[PDB]
Amino acid sequence: YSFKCVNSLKEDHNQPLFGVQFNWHSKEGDPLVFATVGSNRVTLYECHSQGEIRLLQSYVDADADENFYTCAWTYDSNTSHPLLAVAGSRGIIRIINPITMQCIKHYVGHGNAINELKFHPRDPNLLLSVSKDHALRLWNIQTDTLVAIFGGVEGHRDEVLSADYDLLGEKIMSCGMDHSLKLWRINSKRMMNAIKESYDYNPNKTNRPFISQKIHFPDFSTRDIHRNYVDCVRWLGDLILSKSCENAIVCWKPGKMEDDIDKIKPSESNVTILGRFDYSQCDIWYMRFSMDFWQKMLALGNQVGKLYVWDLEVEDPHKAKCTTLTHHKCGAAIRQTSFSRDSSILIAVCDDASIWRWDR
């Protein structure tokens, strides 16, 4: 996997762009579109030939003091139209119609900053938010219900910075400033039932409020992978990729080498390290890697505008093949990357509000 830099631009606000996401629910034949979030806005662009990045429209929050950190795409499960969720310092999740940029509805709960949003891989209505208040929450955006809060003293003890669902959306791994990675299974009887009841809730037809699950005990926890804030995590099948601000993505799994992930118990005290991908100059926290749709590759930018891309299409994780992408004018910290669904474009976004387009 090789790329060349075809364009770049800078947004007018000059504040960090903390998040970038292509819409992988784009319709066939339509051009590729991505969203950026930073300052108090989200902006959409369309990718065209000759490197063109065509500016469409933004949503700008009414509060000049909001600062959006994260966004995620889904679609309306009745109409198929794409939807974009965004959130950040105010702790309010907004669901935006990306065509008109109207905010269709919003959700409050965390009241406290939201550091990441992820939609479930099989159900477009299930949205996970992770917060500076130390909890994760799972919302159903079809019935507008809070399904569950994942927290308690056995939960995270400091800001949660990232989380990821596994392939089938059976379990979440979360991580944050307490240096720990925690697993929360959502295919328990209690959680599958809470999900089904969330779909059954319509406040116009009943008197009761919808009761959320309080999940106070993760199904596995470790602090033995990193020694500082853990700011991005992703499943790779039954293994985990996670990073801190220590210039390494560690590939690891709960338990011993031969332990099946669905047999791990909450008291498991071991982990197995399958590999580690080192890189340079990424000492600051809130720096996220992304993978392509197929999980064949992983990209991470660092604090001086260098991109690293690992090819994971190899027999074992430690055999990953790295290439790097540099441009003499890109020298600000890269906060997040995103691949188009077809893998032909990689976009990096930066602390000086610039956006960089690399074409395969």
């Binding site: 500082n228 000492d283 600051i284 926290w285 809130y286 910290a333 602390d351």
Partner: peptide, 7 residues
């Protein structure tokens, strides 16, 4: 203690 930004 880790910083979010280079400053």
């Amino acid at each position: 203690t880790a910083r979010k930004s280079t400053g």
